[PDB]
């Protein structure tokens, strides 16, 4: 809820300036940023055959994507980042995922730890 509540609105805003995407330029920074966030958010929702994700990992990925730690990334690479970031978080930070899964909430302590993880990983990509 905490994350998808804002993801829904971001995609709602993107869907009403989607047509411009082709023109892309010739438009202010407002709609430009709208449809630069929308493209990243869209490319996060792509998924593959028979590989469902645990709720905490979906939350982590959408958190990275929507809090803004991806707007400085070429859209075509987003998927790779995901498929990398996911695995990374699965390996090292299992405790954070366990806390999100059990508490069922992103406590501000967990929120800060997740921001740190995302920033550190995105730095070395």
């Amino acid at each position: 809820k905490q994350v998808a509540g804002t993801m829904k609105l971001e995609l709602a805003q993107y869907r009403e300036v989607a047509a411009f995407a082709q023109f892309g330029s010739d438009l202010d920074a407002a709609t430009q940023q709208l449809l630069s966030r929308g493209v990243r958010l869209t490319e996060l929702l792509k998924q593959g055959q028979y590989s469902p994700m645990a709720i905490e990992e979906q939350v982590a990925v959408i958190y990275a994507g929507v809090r803004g730690y991806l707007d400085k990334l070429e859209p075509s690479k987003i998927t790779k980042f995901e498929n990398a970031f996911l695995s990374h978080v699965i390996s090292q930070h299992q405790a954070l995922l366990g806390k999100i899964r059990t508490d069922g909430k992103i406590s501000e302590e967990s929120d800060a730890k997740l921001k740190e993880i995302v920033t550190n990983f995105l730095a070395g990509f």
Partner: protein, 159 residues
Amino acid sequence: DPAPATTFAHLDATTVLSRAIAELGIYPAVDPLDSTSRIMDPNIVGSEHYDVARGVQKILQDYKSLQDIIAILGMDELSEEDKLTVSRARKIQRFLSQPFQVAEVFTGHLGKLVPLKETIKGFQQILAGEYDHLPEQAFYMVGPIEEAVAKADKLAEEH
């Protein structure tokens, strides 16, 4: 229609021939964005085959979207990342055509068989951009990609 609609569920692979494509002269008329299969998976046909097939489909779909704009603006107004998309999509449309051995009565050309590796390699190359310098008509009704190169050379020479 109820009859084809009901049959669709009884097949492991459908190749929807289309009248619109056959009007452009592309033969076989197979519709790339409506023919499906059950073995088109990265596990059953391999990663590279799957990536190339999906790339072909995506570029053709992007071209379909662009045609709507090209209808109004004209095509000189298109950006430079899209004129490339349109040109590549036209090249791929042409390259999907092929002359059969049973159509020598119609086309006069010589029927060809293109083993799988030639098809995957040729479409990889057309997508990557290794043939932006050949005219699109160089790909019309040819087998492997090398034959498209030879045909382009012959058109240039006879020019």
